[PDB]
Design a protein around this nucleic acid. Structure first.
Lengths: 212, 50, 98, 135, 134, 72
DNA sequence: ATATATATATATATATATATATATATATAT
DNA sequence: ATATATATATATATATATATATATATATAT
DNA sequence: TGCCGTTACAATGTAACAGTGG
DNA sequence: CCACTGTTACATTGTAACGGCA
């Protein structure tokens, strides 16, 4: 009959969109924030009405995607109604390193709580110090001023990732943080045991990762 | 977790037992009447031939 | 059941259907299959519905360790898990009291 | 009693009959007030998965008119359901033109037998002619 | 064309048939998404008392696979409606036990006649046999 | 549940683009005939929908619509 | 190195719903 | 012929939720 | 071919008659 | 007697398959 919700929208989708949690979750998602198991309320909300939200967001030409690790996010399409952006290469370095720390048992004593200094030390341990520094400044040759510049850049990238939900600052401390499973996306190019050059094409075709 | 797992176990048990009870009874019935009808039919066939 | 006669089989099938009606009201397509299974001209429908029931409980498995997709097999694993959770609950309530 | 009465089946039949009658627009309820009738119908709807309570809903709100039609329809449905098992007990529905049916019914009422019996006698006379032609 | 078709009658027939099918659960509309199907069904429901627009509704949202069934249902409805005026043109429906029906259909298929023609011929032969004996 | 007319407005195929442009701060005037008519028709519900975001859907005296963010 | 933008937290005032206690008129036991 | 119990209306003030404004930390960019 | 009459069913609902046992 | 059951003879609506005809 008329004046009846099923005329325009499914009942469960309307119930989900009328829930008190919908607005904060939608604003965060459109901002690019990933959702992990830690946000128990938001994660459960996404799980319960997961299908309604993928079909709703499809209207924006963006896929609400749940990675096998269990974290939801948004991937815009080429015809996205919501703009799209790509992380910096330094952001990739810090995200890969963050995934390593999530999987690294040596730092188990930290119990998941990490400081930016430790992250930088691990980054320089695994990466090429000076050749990575080259991107921070084209004229760097190990100068300690440029060293501090790279430290500051790493801190800034860490803050941006915090904005993306890959990392949480502690309820009182902004100098310490706890990693989230979302960081696993930084390894999507290696989660499959195949040739790297074919997986990169598969991902870029899927829209997962553009090149630089 | 305990509540959810207990509910799941009870539901599985009840569904499985009731479905088996519902189906196997009629299956055995149909089998028994099939045997009986075959037995009945043989005698008619034998008499008819002569 | 081979010994009994048709009347008892019919009666117990009716009782099983009565239990099912309560046990199936939540589901829509499974309930519809149960309803269709009632036609006497097509006994095979019954079996189909039975399959659906399995085809239902297969998807109700929670995580990988309980993926003994045979539903009758998952019961033992689930009972093991209930017993385990009982011990953890005892420990946890002791901890909360202290 | 020739046909076994099954409670959980006849109850479902009765519930389906009530719902069909209501959706056809008939006043299954015994209430003339709109509100009580609507409430009783809503309760009956809730009773979908509990056929056992349908007998009680009948005893509380069923229209007094419907006892005869109810007891007729469920009886016929039971007979048909039990006869449908085997072909030789089934029934076949056919349509006849008015002149043909008039003659056949007059003949049957003359012989004092059912239509199937009259057809049996007729086809048997024809087959007797065929048999004596064959021998 | 033997029976003249009347729009205000056949359109009411079509509306009643579609409402019956929808109430029975049949998918009336071609829209898989539930929202569009419900909207079209509501349009139809509020469309009562209208031939010239129920026809257009059928043309625009009707399920492709139900066209033939609806057409033949309306054919039968028209024929029955026109034949139900006179007694001699009406049709009488009866139920025959399966063996009797099997034998009668065997005869009808053998002789190429219809059930009515076969029974008429047989009754005439029975009367002729009576006269032969009498 | 949800208001029925609000569901109608959100479901309308124009809603995604208009919503993106509003959340981007764009002002919808009389020139955008379809969008302006849609907002005119469904303002009573979009005001509540965007107040759920602690934002105000304002129709200026000139007529154009826009979103004003609150402190929250 | 410092101007500037942004997010968060707290205090403060508004507006509304609601429970409490009292005042007034009527009903009914004494 | 009386006084107490009831129902009604009212103001009081209690609490919540909202919305505003200010201070803060601090992360960016020239 | 697609419409249009026509047949032969199927499924369900009812009235009427005949039986059966309490 | 009375009620409940079994059965027959319809009606009512829907559908698939033939066959005629533009």
């Amino acid at each position: 009959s008329s004046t009846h919700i099923e005329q325009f929208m499914p009942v469960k989708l309307a119930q989900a969109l009328a829930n008190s949690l919908f607005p904060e979750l939608d604003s965060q998602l459109r901002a690019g924030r990933h959702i992990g198991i830690d946000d128990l309320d938001n994660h459960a909300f996404l799980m319960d009405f997961q299908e309604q939200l993928e079909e709703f967001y499809a209207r924006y030409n963006v896929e609400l995607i749940r990675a096998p690790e269990g974290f939801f996010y948004l991937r815009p399409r080429s015809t996205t109604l919501i703009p799209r952006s790509v992380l910096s290469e330094l952001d990739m370095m810090v995200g890969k390193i963050l995934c390593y720390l999530y999987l690294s048992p040596e730092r188990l004593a930290n119990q998941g709580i990490f400081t930016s200094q430790e992250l930088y030390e691990e980054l320089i341990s695994l990466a090429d110090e000076g050749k990575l520094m080259k991107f921070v400044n084209q004229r760097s040759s190990g100068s300690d001023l440029d060293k501090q510049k790279l430290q500051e850049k790493v801190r800034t990238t860490l803050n941006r990732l915090r904005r993306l939900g890959m990392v949480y600052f502690l309820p009182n401390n902004n100098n310490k943080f706890t990693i989230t499973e979302a960081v696993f996306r930084f390894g999507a190019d290696v989660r499959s045991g195949d040739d790297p050059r074919e997986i990169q094409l598969r991902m870029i075709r899927d829209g997962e990762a553009m090149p630089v | 977790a305990i509540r959810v797992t207990q509910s799941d176990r009870d539901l599985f048990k009840h569904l499985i037992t009731e479905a088996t009870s519902y189906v196997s009874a009629d299956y055995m019935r149909h089998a028994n009447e099939r045997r009986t009808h075959l037995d009945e039919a043989l005698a008619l066939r034998g008499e008819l031939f002569g | 059941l081979a010994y009994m006669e048709g009347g008892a089989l019919r009666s117990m099938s009716d009782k099983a259907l009565g239990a099912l009606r309560l046990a199936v009201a939540d589901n829509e397509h499974l309930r519809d299959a149960l309803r269709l299974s009632e036609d006497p001209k097509r006994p095979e429908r019954k079996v189909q519905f039975f399959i659906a029931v399995y085809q239902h409980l297969r998807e109700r498995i929670r995580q990988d360790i309980i993926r003994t997709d045979d539903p009758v097999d998952a019961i033992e694993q689930m009972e093991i898990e209930l017993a385990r959770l009982t011990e953890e609950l005892t420990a946890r309530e002791q901890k909360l009291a202290i | 009693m020739k046909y076994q009465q099954l409670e959980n089946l006849e109850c479902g039949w009765k519930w389906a009959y009530l719902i069909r009658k209501h959706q056809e627009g008939e006043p299954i309820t015994k209430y003339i007030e709109n509100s009580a009738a609507h409430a009783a119908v809503d309760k009956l709807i809730k009773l979908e998965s509990e056929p056992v309570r349908v007998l009680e809903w009948i005893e509380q709100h069923m229209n007094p008119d419907l006892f005869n039609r109810m007891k007729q329809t469920i009886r016929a449905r039971r007979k048909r359901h039990f006869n449908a098992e085997h072909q030789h007990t089934r029934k076949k529905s056919i349509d006849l033109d008015f002149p043909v049916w008039h003659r056949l019914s007059a003949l049957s009422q003359r012989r004092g037998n059912t239509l199937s019996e009259t057809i049996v006698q007729l086809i048997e006379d024809a087959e007797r002619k065929e048999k004596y032609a064959n021998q």
